[PDB]
Amino acid sequence: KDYESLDYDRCINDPYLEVLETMDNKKGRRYEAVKWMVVFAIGVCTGLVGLFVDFFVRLFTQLKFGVVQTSVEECSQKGCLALSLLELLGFNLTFVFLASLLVLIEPVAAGSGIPEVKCYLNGVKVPGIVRLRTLLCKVLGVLFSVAGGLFVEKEGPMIHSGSVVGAGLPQFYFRSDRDKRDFVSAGAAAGVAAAFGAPIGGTLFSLEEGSSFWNQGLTWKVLFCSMSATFTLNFFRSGIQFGSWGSFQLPGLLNFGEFKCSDSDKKCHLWTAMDLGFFVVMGVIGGLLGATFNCLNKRLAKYRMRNVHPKPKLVRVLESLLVSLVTTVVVFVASMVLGECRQMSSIKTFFCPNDTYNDMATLFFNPQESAILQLFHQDGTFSPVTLALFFVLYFLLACWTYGISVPSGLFVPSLLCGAAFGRLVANVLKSYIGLGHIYSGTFALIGAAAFLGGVVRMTISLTVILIESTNEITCGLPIMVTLMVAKWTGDFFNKGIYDIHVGLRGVPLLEWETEVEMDKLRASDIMEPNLTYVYPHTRIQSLVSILRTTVHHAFPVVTENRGNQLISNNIKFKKSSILTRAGEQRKRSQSTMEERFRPLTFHGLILRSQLVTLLVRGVCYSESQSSASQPRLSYAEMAEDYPRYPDIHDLDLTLLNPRMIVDVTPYMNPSPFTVSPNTHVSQVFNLFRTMGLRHLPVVNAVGEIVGIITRHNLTYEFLQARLRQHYQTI
Amino acid sequence: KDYESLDYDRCINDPYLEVLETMDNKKGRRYEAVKWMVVFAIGVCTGLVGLFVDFFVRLFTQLKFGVVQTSVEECSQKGCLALSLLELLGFNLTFVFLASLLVLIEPVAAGSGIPEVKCYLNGVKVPGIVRLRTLLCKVLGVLFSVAGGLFVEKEGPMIHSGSVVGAGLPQFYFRSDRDKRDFVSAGAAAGVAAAFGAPIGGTLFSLEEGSSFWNQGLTWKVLFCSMSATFTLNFFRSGIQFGSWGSFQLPGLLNFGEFKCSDSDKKCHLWTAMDLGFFVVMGVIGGLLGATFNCLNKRLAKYRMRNVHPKPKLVRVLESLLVSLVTTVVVFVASMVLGECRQMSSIKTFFCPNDTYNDMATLFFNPQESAILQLFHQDGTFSPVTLALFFVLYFLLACWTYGISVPSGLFVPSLLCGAAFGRLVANVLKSYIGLGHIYSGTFALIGAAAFLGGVVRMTISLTVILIESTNEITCGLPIMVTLMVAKWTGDFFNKGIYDIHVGLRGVPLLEWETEVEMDKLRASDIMEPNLTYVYPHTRIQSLVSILRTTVHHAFPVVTENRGNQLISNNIKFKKSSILTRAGEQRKRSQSTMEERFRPLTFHGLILRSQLVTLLVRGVCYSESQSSASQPRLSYAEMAEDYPRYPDIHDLDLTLLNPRMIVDVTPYMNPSPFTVSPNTHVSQVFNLFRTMGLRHLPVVNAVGEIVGIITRHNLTYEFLQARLRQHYQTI
Numbered sequence A, B: 001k002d003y004e005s006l007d008y009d010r011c012i013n014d015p016y017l018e019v020l021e022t023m024d025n026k027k028g029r030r031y032e033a034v035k036w037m038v039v040f041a042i043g044v045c046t047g048l049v050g051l052f053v054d055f056f057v058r059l060f061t062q063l064k065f066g067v068v069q070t071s072v073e074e075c076s077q078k079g080c081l082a083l084s085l086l087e088l089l090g091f092n093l094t095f096v097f098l099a100s101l102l103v104l105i106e107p108v109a110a111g112s113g114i115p116e117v118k119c120y121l122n123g124v125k126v127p128g129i130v131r132l133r134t135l136l137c138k139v140l141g142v143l144f145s146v147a148g149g150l151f152v153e154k155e156g157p158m159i160h161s162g163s164v165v166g167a168g169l170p171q172f173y174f175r176s177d178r179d180k181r182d183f184v185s186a187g188a189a190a191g192v193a194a195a196f197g198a199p200i201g202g203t204l205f206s207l208e209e210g211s212s213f214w215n216q217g218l219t220w221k222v223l224f225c226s227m228s229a230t231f232t233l234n235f236f237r238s239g240i241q242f243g244s245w246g247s248f249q250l251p252g253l254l255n256f257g258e259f260k261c262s263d264s265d266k267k268c269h270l271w272t273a274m275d276l277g278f279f280v281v282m283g284v285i286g287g288l289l290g291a292t293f294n295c296l297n298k299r300l301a302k303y304r305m306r307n308v309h310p311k312p313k314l315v316r317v318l319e320s321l322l323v324s325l326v327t328t329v330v331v332f333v334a335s336m337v338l339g340e341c342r343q344m345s346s347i348k349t350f351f352c353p354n355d356t357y358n359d360m361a362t363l364f365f366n367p368q369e370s371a372i373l374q375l376f377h378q379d380g381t382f383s384p385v386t387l388a389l390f391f392v393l394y395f396l397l398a399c400w401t402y403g404i405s406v407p408s409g410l411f412v413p414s415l416l417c418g419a420a421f422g423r424l425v426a427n428v429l430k431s432y433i434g435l436g437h438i439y440s441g442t443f444a445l446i447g448a449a450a451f452l453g454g455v456v457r458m459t460i461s462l463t464v465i466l467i468e469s470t471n472e473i474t475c476g477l478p479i480m481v482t483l484m485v486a487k488w489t490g491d492f493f494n495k496g497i498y499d500i501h502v503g504l505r506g507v508p509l510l511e512w513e514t515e516v517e518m519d520k521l522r523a524s525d526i527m528e529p530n531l532t533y534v535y536p537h538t539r540i541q542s543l544v545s546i547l548r549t550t551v552h553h554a555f556p557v558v559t560e561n562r563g564n565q566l567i568s569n570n571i572k573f574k575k576s577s578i579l580t581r582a583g584e585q586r587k588r589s590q591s592t593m594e595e596r597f598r599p600l601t602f603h604g605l606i607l608r609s610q611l612v613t614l615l616v617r618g619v620c621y622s623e624s625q626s627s628a629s630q631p632r633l634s635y636a637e638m639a640e641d642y643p644r645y646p647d648i649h650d651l652d653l654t655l656l657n658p659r660m661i662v663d664v665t666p667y668m669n670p671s672p673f674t675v676s677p678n679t680h681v682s683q684v685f686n687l688f689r690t691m692g693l694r695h696l697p698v699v700n701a702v703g704e705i706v707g708i709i710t711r712h713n714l715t716y717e718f719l720q721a722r723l724r725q726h727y728q729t730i
């Protein structure tokens, strides 16, 4: 599978220079104000999408659970205990079928959006990330998947929905990908903020994934977008559930509550230094479990990609129905039988007489985001056997569910198993060890954080998200020293979910940084000496030939270092372009194999899209007339058909007259970032990653271009293979 | 005044390559573990320094105020009302004198450390930033300045103290400035975290000031440092004030408290949408005041630098004593007369009979960080006249105090005037307008935040610091939409305190970003064509001549494009170094004015320090023998005398034998970052800023070096002058 990176690097050429000359300070200030307005609109739209999803998820869930409640109440008195199962199965299967059809419509909507957002922020452009149909399919599939009791979440796909909104809103200026990547960073930040209630967590997630040079003017805007999203979602959701409209009573979709201890016990604390030891042991034991999660889930995915994906589209819908059937049967049987109902608004009474409520029913039949509040702020409600069985039956089914053709998330099903484990360990420690003054909410929170660390294996952004979700600043060390321990324990075995699922698809991904040994390798070894080049004043026949034959997206405009009009024009351009030191000072004062691999002086870079745009129009001059005669496309005309540039195969190829010269000098990028063949892989990777650039040319000390480097030359597998070859040769 | 930038850019040469060859994966893992240990030690040391400062500040303040309390109690009954003033003056003047002597010892300790940290993180190396004596002088001057009632703070100098600790601890490896800058970033983050209780605010401050490429492995470490500092300071300060040791009851030196409303009023909220309008009007009115602050303070500083600084050292001590005398007299008179004591542990009863407490006395005679809690969480304690007079008498004296030769801060004196203004506006709105359900704590907090925005004019970091100090996540929009409004209102008049005070000193500072028009200017216009160059295999006489004559810190190793042994060796090196495209593919398969301004082929960069190190040793070969004979200094030997490299004037110049060839090829940086003369100022600034590099060479398309660019070529004044010249010429 092949993917095309983003054109993030700014191309400054003659039309851009003309536009810059036209633009003054006042126009720049107006442009910046319009950018602020667009950012605010993106944030508000993300908040409204979150409100939509939450409102219909709650409506459908409450409706189906009320029907099931009445059916159970009647059928238990009758003793049938079967019709309620049939109605629950009907609801679950219908919802899962409606959620899977929408993913069959748009395949990229399957699963959490983070694997498809880590790549776009990396600039890989997975086909179908940012599109209206993808947004509609994911939004309408989340509320039909989580409402079906599939043990999935809503805060995962919110990031992808925010990214799509942020890519879509600015496009009615703002055409270039240099702005689109920033706007999708803002959209992802807004999505995270609306999902978890943490705006700073969202902006740090956007900074961490879209790694680039520090841009304060953009970080301020993305922080504003996150705050606006999380404070319009708050405003609507606290004005709908309650009666007060102006109040801001509840944060985004996932909130933990108020972590306060009872005032009766003065000795009680949120956490103490002595408990910190447990916070590392829960970090390891949880982290190992996270690794086990990976060890299962990957083994499932590689199965499906070999036995489920290459099957007719009728399959991948039967699998979703099977998963829904199994999870519904497991939930119903576990609540009916294994549930140990004890004596007494989210309290469920099932299958046993009055003044008795099933803890299992309160865990399963409540919403997942409402089964975390009980695990955090209720003590004595849950027996150890119930917690153990809930952890077992919510860990296997979570592994089995993720990957099927429905929208899903992995932050609630991972925050719930961890919370159950923390509650279980707190109960065990309180009972057997007898260590008093253990606030079980802290242990449940630490278990949830450790399980996220083991499964997701994120840092910085995850720590901030958790800290701002807890709404406590004193719980900053226990949360972070367990994320770090879980990450270090789970890194010995295998990577995280998102890294695994972006490596399975074959996406060319640049890692965070290189190892120590990579500096042994030089930039002369990862480049490709064989080049496809475009002369200035080249023939149109040569352009169409190299465009149809080759699939590269950028060509170095070069001149040979060692017809008549073409050669004369190239020589004149070479003489005029070069700027000597003495000439510059004077200006300031005035005020076969050898033929195949030929010395070529590097002059610039021209994209395939720009060449196609030139070919479509009549931008070309006959050899008889001078090079001055050119239509001279402006910036606006060259930016037309931006989202989808025409292909060379699409173009008619009949109207174009071959053997007629075309000038590519005014439109190329005369000053791209260049590296020497002696540069080490660390510096090359640093430029290619932080600058977000593409098609880095390697030029030696004589000025001749000696190679070209793209993302495919800097992938981890390529570096490992080249390092192994370097070791073998010496 | 001249300043020398940091050598942040990594120089990879032959000794470094040998060390890399020796180093394996296990040694790298051990190195990374040692780095983690160093980061943790830096955080713990910063926390302990904060504990030291807080404990002695509290001890001295409580002692002097107890003595003053007893003296007032006796003298008011006697009616003398004078001996208490004498004792207070004695304490204040003694403390201020002891604080000013320590700044006369170390001049760079004067004022807040942020102006001297924004420059070091920018890589300017102001002389005396990171030194043991500077740390001792600042730490022992803060507790003698704030204890003297000088209307100053402690959280400002904590950043500088953390930076000094982070620069000092790693140096017992870790020698190069590439590590020192990262460690001072971690130290500044730890200082901010210990000062304000916000670790994430500290790491974001470090990211925002030391602008560079994204480094996750470093951001994780600096976050760990901040958390460790703020949780060891918490552990000690909550175990000393209280009896419980393991508990973490209070955050760092500046805490706001618990922003909760009374449970009696259900209708009450922290803030509502309708109040948001006021939050922008307080943003403007406060911001304007901040501008006025600047408009005064700068006018004072430019006065002193012309009438106080060029005076004997006896002056700058009399001024501090005068300021202390005036502020003590003002405090005593305002509390004695203007105080309107009302009927009833931080409650002060002065000069009026029983069951009456002076609100003015409770404002002034309490610690400044304890006069913010009252303004946030007490209603009806303060009359409008008292608040107005307190704002007037705490705004003029704050302007007058800052800049004198004592350690000081500007976050408490700015957080207290803003809090007083917010309390006053809340009282006025409640009384006259009658708008009920107004929680005055929110108004005081918004006033304080708006005043900080007007004075300090920071974003991102300041917003996070305030949000985590308030310990509330729902107060995230009102705080930020008032910082942004204050910044936009105060930017029309003049810049912030720190920018003003770093522009007065003449520090060459790179701004956050360039304007729109700067892209009109090219890299050919900001470079210097006149070059001081070093040939490979150059004569030692030429090196000593160009080292003594010129003050540049880097020279391009070049060869002429157009004795006998020297010329032969240079020609051989030029032939061997160049790597052609065909040659590389074959290797892979095998497996006057004109004389002054001469074409020179760029090969590398050699620093002045490296040349001096080579000259000190006998690294040189006679012309009779070949170039193979070289002592070949290793990496460890070249890294000796790192903190202070020898000067060319210091070296004897007698033992060195002139006219004897020296080879600089093995030790130069063969692959520095280069730019084309056609690059625009935006890209050049981006590389020079984010990469943190130094001495960027401009090389044309023939491979000849055409210019050199340093920080002095990218300062705002230089760009403005060059743009004006460009406009004038055309």
Ligand SMILES: Nc1ncnc2c1ncn2[C@@H]1O[C@H](COP(=O)(O)OP(=O)(O)OP(=O)(O)O)[C@@H](O)[C@H]1O
Pocket: A003, A004, A005, A006, A528, A530, A531, A532, A533, A551, A552, A553, A554, A555, A556, A694, A695, A708, A709, A710, A711, A712, A713
């Ligand atoms: N113009 C070019 N001439 C020769 N080789 C090239 C050229 N551009 C890229 N390459 C190299 O060819 C290989 C594959 O190129 P490919 O066609 O996949 O690149 P691309 O699609 O233009 O790049 P990207 O995936 O970064 O958008 C890589 O090693 C790349 O460095």
Ligand SMILES: Nc1ncnc2c1ncn2[C@@H]1O[C@H](COP(=O)(O)OP(=O)(O)OP(=O)(O)O)[C@@H](O)[C@H]1O
Pocket: B003, B004, B005, B006, B528, B530, B531, B532, B533, B551, B552, B553, B554, B555, B556, B694, B695, B708, B709, B710, B711, B712, B713
């Ligand atoms: N080797 C050099 N030859 C010629 N000009 C140079 C050289 N190095 C720097 N310059 C230029 O000379 C001017 C002043 O140089 P200066 O001596 O102040 O630099 P420096 O002290 O080496 O640099 P820095 O302040 O970045 O540490 C600037 O325009 C700078 O770009």
Ligand SMILES: [Cl-]
Pocket: A153, A154, A155, A156, A157, A409, A410, A411, A412
């Ligand atoms: Cl989720």
Ligand SMILES: [Cl-]
Pocket: A112, A113, A114, A155, A156, A157, A408, A409, A410, A411
């Ligand atoms: Cl997810």
Ligand SMILES: [Cl-]
Pocket: B153, B154, B155, B156, B157, B409, B410, B411, B412
């Ligand atoms: Cl301060």
Ligand SMILES: [Cl-]
Pocket: B112, B113, B114, B155, B156, B157, B408, B409, B410, B411
């Ligand atoms: Cl300060």
Ligand SMILES: [Mg+2]
Pocket: A002, A003, A004, A551
């Ligand atoms: Mg491709």
Ligand SMILES: [Mg+2]
Pocket: B002, B003, B004, B551
């Ligand atoms: Mg200098």
